[PDB]
Structure 1
Amino acid sequence: EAAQSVDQLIKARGKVYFGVATDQNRLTTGKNAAIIQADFGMVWPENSMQWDATEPSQGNFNFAGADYLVNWAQQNGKLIGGGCLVWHSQLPSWVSSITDKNTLTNVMKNHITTLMTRYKGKIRTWDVVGEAFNEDGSLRQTVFLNVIGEDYIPIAFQTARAADPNAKLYIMDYNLDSASYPKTQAIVNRVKQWRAAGVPIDGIGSQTHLSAGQGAGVLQALPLLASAGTPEVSILMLDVAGASPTDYVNVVNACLNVQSCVGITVMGVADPDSWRASTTPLLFDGNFNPKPAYNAIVQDLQQ
């Protein structure tokens, strides 16, 4: 990695990684691979480890895309993140149609154990449960909550811990960017209770899809998230409408201010590949050149 890469510079400040989400298609097009090799220390799969990619029909697993990402990361000395193991948004129809509690519990356990066992020892962080909370802090009414009940979250983490004790297990959600927002306060209290009951939640991953100007509020929200007492917290899938250096520097400084925040992962590399490309929210432009926000992060990390 470059000496002045954001990953090398955030390591020198005591953190673990500066990461990025990617997948096979990106790694063979443009300059994505060259930038990841030089500038980032951890890679995450955008879609290749989601449920509809890995188990499109029950017990008929497909790992071709995820294997590609894992192999590439190992050949290039990058840490690997994985997920999401339990998430309502990318579910095959055969899962969402299950109505029996014992059936769905076993299907969920098998999905978790099969993915984690395949990459046992190679994955630093697994997103086990994603987007479980409504905006008011109540639990989102997914098929898992409807059929298994709220015990599905404890069961998921206990199953994951048993499959690979080397991985850090995370719950993840979005709109945890304001200290006064109900979802931010609700998840802290719920995670405290689960850990008090012995559930092995190692971390909270904050998605951090920001509108312009919302970076300032992370300075207070991230300390709040860390007050839940998990071993780790992180910023995940970071992007910012407008990509103002002020917002990006604020998010980095929040990470630096929180001892338990281990790193930051951005949603992608180049603006045109973003889901909201018209807001140019990433750190590299269409020609794969660093944007002012990138140079501002580098400068903030140097001194």
Structure 2
Amino acid sequence: QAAQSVDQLIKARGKVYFGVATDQNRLTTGKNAAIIQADFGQVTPENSMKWDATEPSQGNFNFAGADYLVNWAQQNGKLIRGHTLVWHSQLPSWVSSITDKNTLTNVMKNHITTLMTRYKGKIRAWDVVNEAFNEDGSLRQTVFLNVIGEDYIPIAFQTARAADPNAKLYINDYNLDSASYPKTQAIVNRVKQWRAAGVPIDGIGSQTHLSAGQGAGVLQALPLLASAGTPEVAITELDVAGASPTDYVNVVNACLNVQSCVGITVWGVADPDSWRASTTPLLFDGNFNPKPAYNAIVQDLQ
């Protein structure tokens, strides 16, 4: 645990939180729990709330891991972002085997409703639809799009709003880091259109999985995302290859510059546990010590 808390400091700047991804396996090992208790104010389950973990067989739900995280977060006063309801990856074979529209629609709605009701009122925001866009801006052809059609997105959001009206509903994606990139422009246009049609999309989540030097582009991309008119935008899965203080400070500044940016979530605590460990992209090193980038963020926020 670093003496200075980036969550406390970003709250003092007027934002809601600075959080991290975690789960039971991290919370019960090393210094993870201590670091999260002291330096962060929000948690996102890395895997425990995904479809494969929660509904491995239709109608046979498993909430053991999710319950652990939600209870831990509640006891320690941390906000929670549910992740993620509709996604083509980590999807059980029984789902992708369905070719009937009525069936898949009902299965999808039941999955959304069951997960959201269980934690009704305890989840700040949910990543309802994840990675629905192709790099060229068109919609990714997943089983949901192929079987249900474009309406699967409006249906997912309408169903989520009904299950828990307290939660902020997000569409989440990666490679929305450059204002000139087709994907960035497309999600803004589609979200504008969906909201105009009454679809309840409260926020756009930008994963922000960056390579060295890409932080600068976020200074323009984030305000562009905010122009879609959603109540909120957030940096949801931040990590930067090389963990340069320059890239990290640029991302934090981008959020500070955008009124609707509510917070930032970094994807993990210590480098070894990163999904991209070879690029040592996080804020704490292998020995759980804060890295230069962490200190740079603290200094930038003071």
- The TM-score, its normalising length taken from structure 2, stands at 0.99
Q: Is the 1:51–1:85 Cα contact (8 Å) retained in structure 2?
A: yes
Take 2:65 and 2:154, find their aligned partners in 1: how far apart are those partners? 29
Shift of 1:80: 0.7
Q: Is the 1:208–1:238 Cα contact (8 Å) retained in structure 2?
A: yes
Q: Is the 1:43–1:78 Cα contact (8 Å) retained in structure 2?
A: yes
| Structure 2: runs of 5 or more not aligned | none
Take 2:53 and 2:279, find their aligned partners in 1: how far apart are those partners? 28
Q: Is the 2:158–2:200 Cα contact (8 Å) retained in structure 1?
A: yes
Take 1:167 and 1:65, find their aligned partners in 2: how far apart are those partners? 21
Q: Is the 2:113–2:160 Cα contact (8 Å) retained in structure 1?
A: yes
Q: Percent identity?
A: 95
Shift of 1:292: 0.1
Q: What's the CA shift string for 1:70-102, capped at 9, x where partnerless?
A: 000001000011021000011000000100000
Query: Which has the higher mean CA deviation after the structures are superposed, 122-131 or 275-284?
Result: 275-284
Shift of 1:3: 7.3
Q: What's the CA shift string for 1:120-173, capped at 9, x where partnerless?
A: 000001000000000000000000000000000000000000000000000000
Take 2:117 and 2:3, find their aligned partners in 1: how far apart are those partners? 35
Secondary structure at the aligned position of 1:74 is classed as: helix
Q: What's the CA shift string for 1:23-72, capped at 9, x where partnerless?
A: 00000000000000000000010000000000000000000000000000
Q: Is the 1:2–1:8 Cα contact (8 Å) retained in structure 2?
A: no
Secondary structure at the aligned position of 2:298 is classed as: helix
Q: What's the CA shift string for 1:261-300, capped at 9, x where partnerless?
A: 0000000000011122121100000010000000000000
Shift of 1:181: 0.2
Shift of 1:4: 2.5
Take 1:160 and 1:114, find their aligned partners in 2: how far apart are those partners? 10
Secondary structure at the aligned position of 1:91 is classed as: coil
Q: Is the 1:18–1:265 Cα contact (8 Å) retained in structure 2?
A: yes
Q: Is the 1:23–1:48 Cα contact (8 Å) retained in structure 2?
A: yes
Shift of 1:2: 7.8
- The TM-score, its normalising length taken from structure 1, stands at 0.99
Take 1:207 and 1:82, find their aligned partners in 2: how far apart are those partners? 14
Q: What's the CA shift string for 1:233-281, capped at 9, x where partnerless?
A: 0001100000000000000000000000000000000001112212110
Take 2:81 and 2:139, find their aligned partners in 1: how far apart are those partners? 25
Take 2:120 and 2:230, find their aligned partners in 1: how far apart are those partners? 22
RMSD: 0.9
| Structure 1: runs of 5 or more not aligned | none
Structure 1 equivalent of residue 81 of structure 2: 81
Take 2:46 and 2:136, find their aligned partners in 1: how far apart are those partners? 27
Take 2:79 and 2:280, find their aligned partners in 1: how far apart are those partners? 27
Give structure 1 regions of 4+ aligned residues with deviation exceeding 4 angstroms: none
Structure 2 equivalent of residue 140 of structure 1: 140
Q: What's the CA shift string for 1:164-204, capped at 9, x where partnerless?
A: 00000000000000000000000000000000000000000
